[PDB]
Curated annotation (Swiss-Prot), chain A:
UniProt pathway: Cofactor biosynthesis; riboflavin biosynthesis; 2-hydroxy-3-oxobutyl phosphate from D-ribulose 5-phosphate: step 1/1
MF annotations from Gene Ontology: 3,4-dihydroxy-2-butanone-4-phosphate synthase activity; magnesium ion binding; manganese ion binding
EC number of this enzyme: 4.1.99.12
EC class of the enzyme, as a word: lyase
The name this protein goes by in its record: 3,4-dihydroxy-2-butanone 4-phosphate synthase
GO terms of biological process kind: riboflavin biosynthetic process
Cofactor: binding comment: Binds 2 divalent metal cations per subunit. Magnesium or manganese.
InterPro entries, sorted: DHBP_synth_RibB-like_a/b_dom (IPR017945), DHBP_synthase_RibB (IPR000422)
Curated annotation (Swiss-Prot), chain B:
Binding site for Mg(2+) 2: 140
Function: Catalyzes the conversion of D-ribulose 5-phosphate to formate and 3,4-dihydroxy-2-butanone 4-phosphate.
Gene3D superfamilies referenced in this protein's UniProt entry, alphabetically: DHBP synthase
Keyword Lyase: yes
Protein name from the UniProt record: 3,4-dihydroxy-2-butanone 4-phosphate synthase
Database matches in InterPro entries: DHBP_synth_RibB-like_a/b_dom, DHBP_synthase_RibB
Entries under SUPFAM superfamilies matching the protein: YrdC/RibB (SSF55821)
EC number: 4.1.99.12
Keyword Lyase on entry: yes
Binding site for D-ribulose 5-phosphate: 29, 137-141, 161
Amino acid sequence: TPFERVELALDALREGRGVMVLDDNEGDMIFPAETMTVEQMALTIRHGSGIVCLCITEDRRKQLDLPMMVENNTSAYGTGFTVTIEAAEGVTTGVSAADRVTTVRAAIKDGAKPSDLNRPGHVFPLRAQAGGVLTRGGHTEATIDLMTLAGFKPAGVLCELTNDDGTMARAPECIAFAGQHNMAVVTIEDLVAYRQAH
Amino acid sequence: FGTPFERVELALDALREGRGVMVLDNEGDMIFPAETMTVEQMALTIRHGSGIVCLCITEDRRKQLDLPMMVENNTSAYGTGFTVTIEAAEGVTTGVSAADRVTTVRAAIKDGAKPSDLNRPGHVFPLRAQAGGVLTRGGHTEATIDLMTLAGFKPAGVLCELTNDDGTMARAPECIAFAGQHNMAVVTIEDLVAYRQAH
C-alpha cells in the first residue's frame, strides 16, 4: 500500500540506506544528507547524472545566504537551483565523492554560516517549496518530506539514475537497481496520499 | 613522448577528426568540440566523468546569450567561473539524458543563438573562459578554448573531469590509459602554454 511503502522507506532512511523516489519516468536515488557516505556518493556519481543535488529548505537557504541562481526561473519544472557550493575547507577540487560529501556536511552541519562555504562549486543546492509534495509534486519536495518524516534535518542528497548508454532510467531499471542496493522504492503519489491522510 | 609542439598539434588533429582530447595539468579533463560531439560521446563522459559536464565559452558568446555570472564575488579555490546554468528551451525533456545535454549544447552554440533559445536553470553548466586563454589563466577552461580556436573551431567546447568508479579523481596514468582506450589525444596545459608562447 501507499502507506506501507512510505513507512518502509522512512525505515530505510533511518538504517542509513537509500531510497529510489519515482513519479511521472525518472527515478532519483536519495540519501539523508547527514548519514551519506563517500561510498554512497561514489555510487550516485557512478550511476547518477553526476549532477548531485542537496535538497534544502528556504530557512537553511537563508541561513547560508544562497541566492536563487536565476531571478526569473524559466526551466520546464521551475526546478529551483540556488547558487552552487563548495566546502570552504577540507576539499581540493571539490569533485571527488569524498569532496562532494565534505561540501555537503559543511552545508548541513549545525550552525553552518555562509563563510563555511565557497561559491560556485560542485554541489548544487535545491530549495524545496514550502508545502512539500502537497505544494509541489517534485523530487525536491519528495526528498524533503521523507527526511522530515524520518525525523531528519530537512536536508537530503539526490540524483537521477542513468543507464550507462546515457539514457535516463525507467521504473523497472530504477527498481532492479534499488533492489540491488538495499534501497527502498517509493512514489511521489504514495507520499502525497500518505500526507493527505496524516 | 615527442615535444610540446608535436603534442599540441597532434591534439588539434584529434579535434578535427571529431575525437576527444584528454587535457592534463593530476586532474584530467575529457573535452570535445561542442560542434561535433555526439550523444554517444556525451554518454561516455557522463559514464566516466564527474557527470558535471561543462560548456566552455567566450565572454562574447556569454553576452550573446545573456548569461550572468552565477556569483558576483567568486570565492571558489580556482575562480572557476561558472555562469548561470542552462537548458535547451526545446527538443529536450528533463535535460539530463546524454541526448538532452547535447541538444542543450547545440542550442547554445548554434549560429545566431538568442537568449530565448535557452532556459535557466538547467543541467548544462557554462564556463566563461578568461580573455587571454592559458596565457592569462592556466585552467582547463582556457585550455579548452584555445584548442578549439586553434583547431579552427568555434571557441566553444565541452569538458568533464575523469572519475575512477570508486569515486576518486583520475590521475595521469589513468587519464592516459583511458585516453588511449578512446582514441583520445593527450595534452598538457604546459605544452599548450609553451606552444602559444612561441607562436
